[PDB]
Design a protein around this ligand. Structure first.
Ligand SMILES: [Ca+2]
Ligand SMILES: [Ca+2]
Ligand SMILES: [Ca+2]
Ligand SMILES: [Ca+2]
Length: 108
């Protein structure tokens, strides 16, 4: 589980940092949560928990509910914040985030 990989305190800190709407920034979240320090294998396990429909890609509602995978009572991302996530990750113009793209974004 995500819980088996990141510390609960770092997750709590990351959510605290982006409590107000339109303050989520991918890079800050990945740093505060500790995701940017994890190995490729650990980042892939997190990717699998976020990919709710097991399509192999993050898209649609999975972006809006991104924080909710870390704590089920977290807020939804705004449309602007979901666009920031896609802008940060997409490199092949398909409008979805593959596992490779996720790894590259997290480690940036
Ligand atoms: Ca490391
Ligand atoms: Ca998916
Ligand atoms: Ca909570
Ligand atoms: Ca893509």
């Amino acid at each position: 589980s995500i819980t088996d990989i990141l510390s609960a305190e770092d997750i709590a800190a990351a959510l605290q940092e982006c409590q107000d709407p339109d303050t989520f920034e991918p890079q800050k979240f990945f740093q505060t949560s500790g995701l940017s320090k994890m190995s490729a294998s650990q980042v892939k396990d997190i990717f699998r928990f976020i990919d709710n429909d097991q399509s192999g890609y993050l898209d649609g509602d999975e972006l809006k509910y991104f924080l909710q995978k870390f704590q089920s009572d977290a807020r939804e991302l705004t449309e602007s914040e979901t666009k920031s996530l896609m802008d940060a990750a997409d490199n092949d113009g398909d409008g979805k985030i593959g596992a490779d793209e996720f790894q590259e974004m997290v480690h940036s």
